[PDB]
Ligand binder design. Structure first.
Ligand SMILES: CC(=O)N[C@H]1[C@@H](O[C@@H]2O[C@H](C[C@@H](O)[C@H]3O[C@@H](n4ccc(=O)[nH]c4=O)[C@H](O)[C@@H]3O)[C@H](O)[C@H](O)[C@H]2NC(=O)/C=C/CCCCCCCCC(C)C)O[C@H](CO)[C@@H](O)[C@@H]1O
Ligand SMILES: CC(=O)N[C@H]1[C@@H](O[C@@H]2O[C@H](C[C@@H](O)[C@H]3O[C@@H](n4ccc(=O)[nH]c4=O)[C@H](O)[C@@H]3O)[C@H](O)[C@H](O)[C@H]2NC(=O)/C=C/CCCCCCCCC(C)C)O[C@H](CO)[C@@H](O)[C@@H]1O
Ligand SMILES: CCCCCCCC/C=C\CCCCCCCC(=O)O[C@H](COC(=O)CCCCCCCCCCCCCCC)COP(=O)(O)OC[C@@H](O)CO
Ligand SMILES: CCCCCCCC/C=C\CCCCCCCC(=O)O[C@H](COC(=O)CCCCCCCCCCCCCCC)COP(=O)(O)OC[C@@H](O)CO
Lengths: 378, 369
């Protein structure tokens, strides 16, 4: 088809634009203090933050320039068009929200609320165009709720699985590429329009995020930040909702779902939650070791002690106990998939750990394809 | 029923703006998004880019209002896509303005990006209306679209350069928005009702959110609106004008801004040297704003333009190491100060708002009487 060919062309041009512009704007970001230190390395220099915006920006540009080509010599159908524009409005609002969130570092209340507001246009489009709120049970209003929350989830599910160089953009590239392959396979199948739409929004995302990862990859010269996390989350939520494969998509979100649940006791502050739960480097080794959350044992609530004991029993959390004059203490293992891989394999270098998590992501995607198409497993 | 709900949510949004602007002050100051009131003695920092909150609220409101018009209304996808496309243009303008303020992009970006962000407006205009003919009966064709594109840019920047005194940006934007609201209501009973009810949908919430912003921005300014609000407002106006089919009437409402943009044009083009700031210098003793000047070496076209201006009495010119010329900084503000001498900041803002209202009354008189 011509629309997809044109789309791929503008997407590669956008990849070049991203790789080019990211260094071109470095002075601006440094000047306005939109930067952060590399916590996992000994160096203390600043690195430009929220580079996702640039990719995001390019992304938007591309799609704005690509809208007409599907409708070439095509009573104009305003519904396909409104799907496009509504999805783009959702993504614009999510990019803007992530950029504002990186400049201001809003509290979690805002981080959860605002992606839902920004996902409303998605629900408008879904209701005017498709509207099928059935899974044989009719989910009704709940279904819309789901879609809303989906957006939030994605934006934040990628957001909390972060901290090592190239993980956010990397795992987002794996997810986007897997969704692209799924779209292509289904492209010959029953639902062609939904999946060609998913492609329209994925391909440029993949290539712009690739331009971003070029700089973000270890050693990280740039950081993607909440801008990229939110942007990616909403793009995925869009193609999943308006593509009608949100189940398959969430299956692709297996590492992120597992890490979000495994972190859930800390995110709810049942077990104390540090401000950063990244694996903290060992200066002698040069590799990343696990990171811990320490606290007075007595203060901990009953539910917290129960969850911690069950986790220790399952061999998921490392627990240490030490005696101090002021009070009794019990160290806990920071509960994030990264610290869990480090519990399983001990010290790992940053680049190798990122590669390992990308590998595990690919395994998750392969599992999803096997489920979808009755393939052989392992 | 739809307009009544629009007004309700717009007042709720006014409350939301007035409440949130101080709620987020900590965030803006902590992230160094602030600036010093150059025209006041104090040196403290004032939070910048507060138009991002109002703007944000604005978007929220409209996102929530979208359904009320289509209540049990072959769904009308064209009306719906116009609402969405306008919202998309406005989102990209709020976002681009906020990013511009944080990063302080060069003029190249400032001009290019509102055109890109205005493309969805042109797409909606082509799919829905597409009329590229004006009676003057000439089918402008592609140029028409160009116009619309540039219109966006112009507005976003036309309000942008007319700035620097407490409450001028949001104030003049409120006058323009209110004038367009009145015009929409007058034409509401006339031939074109849908266009003007659309313009109202977008204008009422903008008016009330911008009002919440001006509450804090008014002399003495406790906040600043910044490129965020300038871009946001400019694009909301360009939208309602384009998709409402009254961009000529609108631009007539942009009378002070057009005059100030053209009067500044020889400096903006660097024919006459242009300082980074061209606001009026406060007089320490007087407590009132006098004119400001650009000083540069006298030793081709620029000199002729300055002589012409001197003859016209629009620019005041005074002529060590070499001959230097202290030309009067060419902005409607410095021109009002050249006509009336020193004026206090609040009084000068009020005066420019009154002149804006005079321009709007002129526009109404031309159109109607
Ligand atoms: C809580 C949490 O884990 N936050 C993360 C999250 O916190 C955000 O951090 C960000 C900064 C972080 O990226 C820094 O790490 C450094 N860095 C970055 C890359 C890199 O390669 N190397 C490096 O050193 C670098 O300095 C960088 O500035 C930012 O401050 C967010 O505001 C902050 N809060 C949240 O995400 C909220 C997150 C709220 C999560 C709530 C989830 C809600 C989902 C609900 C869905 C439900 C309805 C289904 O990210 C951090 C890692 O990037 C984690 O350490 C931190 O723990
Ligand atoms: C050149 C110029 O005049 N710049 C302005 C413009 O410059 C922008 O400044 C901005 C900040 C400014 O708002 C400051 O004013 C201060 N302020 C404001 C009120 C107040 O009460 N107190 C206070 O202190 C406060 O500190 C604040 O930081 C910003 O940095 C832009 O990058 C900067 N450039 C442009 O707009 C470019 C604008 C590009 C103009 C070209 C557009 C061409 C349009 C073409 C359209 C055509 C197709 C029809 O705005 C300034 C604000 O007054 C002016 O003084 C300044 O002179
Ligand atoms: C369509 C949406 C697009 C959004 C674009 C995102 C841009 C982000 C920048 C500014 C957001 C301004 C509006 C935020 C509205 C947030 C609304 C909110 O937080 O409600 C709180 C009450 O519960 C009050 O709050 P508070 O301060 O008491 O909590 C501490
Ligand atoms: C849809 C619109 C969304 C806008 C989103 C707003 C986000 C704002 C942040 C970054 C903008 C990135 C995209 C802008 C694309 C604009 C493309 C562009 O500027 O290319 C020009 C080349 O001709 C100049 O190039 P340059 O490298 O020389 O100048 C860099 C500077 O460091 C020079 O001082």
């Amino acid at each position: 088809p011509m629309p997809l060919l044109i789309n791929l062309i503008v997407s590669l041009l956008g990849f070049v634009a991203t790789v080019t512009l990211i260094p071109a704007f470095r002075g601006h970001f440094i000047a306005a203090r939109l930067c952060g230190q590399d916590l996992n390395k000994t160096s203390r220099q600043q690195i430009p933050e929220s580079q996702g915006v640039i990719s995001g920006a390019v992304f938007l540009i591309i799609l704005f320039c690509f809208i007409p080509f599907p409708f070439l010599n095509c009573a104009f159908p305003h519904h396909e068009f409104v799907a496009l524009i509504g999805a783009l409005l959702a993504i614009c609002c999510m990019i803007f929200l992530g950029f504002a969130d990186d400049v201001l570092n809003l509290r979690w209340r805002h981080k959860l609320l605002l992606p839902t507001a920004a996902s409303l246009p998605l629900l408008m489009v879904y209701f005017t165009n498709f509207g099928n709120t059935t899974i044989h049970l009719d989910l009704g209003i709940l279904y819309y709720v789901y879609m809303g929350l989906l957006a939030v989830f994605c934006t934040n599910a990628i957001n909390i699985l972060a901290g090592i160089n190239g993980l956010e953009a990397g795992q987002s590239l794996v997810i986007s590429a897997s969704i692209i392959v799924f779209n292509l396979v289904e492209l010959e199948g029953d639902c062609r329009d939904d999946h060609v739409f998913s492609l329209y929004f994925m391909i440029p995302f993949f290539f712009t995020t690739l331009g971003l990862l070029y700089h973000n990859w270890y050693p990280s010269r740039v950081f993607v930040g909440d801008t990229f996390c939110y942007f990616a989350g909403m793009t995925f939520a869009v193609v999943g909702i308006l593509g009608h494969f949100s189940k398959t998509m969430l299956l692709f979100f297996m590492p992120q779902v597992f890490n979000f649940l495994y972190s859930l006791p800390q995110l709810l502050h049942i077990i104390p939650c540090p401000r950063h739960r990244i694996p903290r480097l060992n200066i002698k080794t040069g590799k990343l070791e696990m990171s811990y959350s320490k606290f007075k044992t007595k203060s901990l609530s009953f539910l917290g002690t129960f969850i911690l004991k069950v986790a220790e029993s399952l061999q998921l959390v490392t627990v240490h106990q030490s005696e101090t004059e002021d009070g009794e203490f019990t160290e806990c293992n920071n509960m994030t998939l990264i610290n869990l891989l480090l519990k399983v394999l001990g010290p790992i270098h940053e680049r190798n750990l990122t590669l390992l998590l990308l590998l595990l992501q690919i395994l998750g995607s392969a599992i999803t394809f096997s489920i979808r198409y009755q393939l052989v497993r392992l």
